[PDB]
Write a protein that binds this ligand. Sequence first.
Ligand SMILES: [Cl-]
Ligand SMILES: [Cu+2]
Ligand SMILES: [Cu+2]
Lengths: 170, 170
Amino acid sequence: GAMGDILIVWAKDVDEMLKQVEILRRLGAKQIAVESSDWRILQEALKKGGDILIVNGGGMTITFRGDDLEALLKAAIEMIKQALKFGATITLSLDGNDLNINITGVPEQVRKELAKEAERLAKEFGITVTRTGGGDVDEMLKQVEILRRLGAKQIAVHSDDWRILQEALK
Amino acid sequence: GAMGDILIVWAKDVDEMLKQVEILRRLGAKQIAVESSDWRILQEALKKGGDILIVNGGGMTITFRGDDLEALLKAAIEMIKQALKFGATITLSLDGNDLNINITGVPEQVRKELAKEAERLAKEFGITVTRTGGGDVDEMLKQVEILRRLGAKQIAVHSDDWRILQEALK
Ligand SMILES: [Cl-]
Ligand SMILES: [Cu+2]
Ligand SMILES: [Cu+2]
């Protein structure tokens, strides 16, 4: 189309992903890339006729959930300050009663510290937290091969994520 | 490669972009996509042999600059709270004495309010701010055609950005 060739959907939920893909198809979108740290969401994207995927190998998505948005933001702000100081790239969105934080470009030890801090902050502000991705390099290699077997034609990785993984491989 | 086909570089500076592309090429990367709200950075990415670009049509990159990181973070935190409340997707990184904020998925009026607030916060915390992108839909259509003329093969748009632009077109 006149504005570009590919639309990028950041998918945090399988049903929201399918709803978004459908809305874009009705608006005349022809190629939809799906980005998610959840391997099942990426597998579902392929099943629905997508073939461009953005994967998260060494990073993770932290999802804070709760009815008080100001509590979600206080928890998120602490994660943001720490993640940025460690040299992370962070993507944030509000999704209903959820605040989603994608974190890339930090080594395994730092990822572990940020995961622990997410748990601590969740308790402190009386909210819940779920973590997706941040598996080892071996699991990433396996899941990428599975996406390829299921018909992925183009797999993209954030360069900071890829650099950390290549250092972990060495 | 074993981890994927494409690496995504978020480029905020033309020299940093070229340095990153070179580091990845030396690590054995074969396809590098460049994402930036700066049309000249994307043109430079093509000149260096790239052909995959991620553009920002209706959104913008806000860059806070200053020697006190705690001042940069206070300004960024206010932008984050407001942007998220407006339904924005936000990407953040630290780059030397710079804090970069990519904002997508808000209409023109909201973008204008966030730009004004960035200026106000910069003054309040004794730091500087620069804005990139957030031009009208006509300028986006023109610059995408120019990228295509200069040899872009795949142009990607964030789905939230694209939805806002299609609403602006209508
Ligand atoms: Cl992306
Ligand atoms: Cu991303
Ligand atoms: Cu992006």
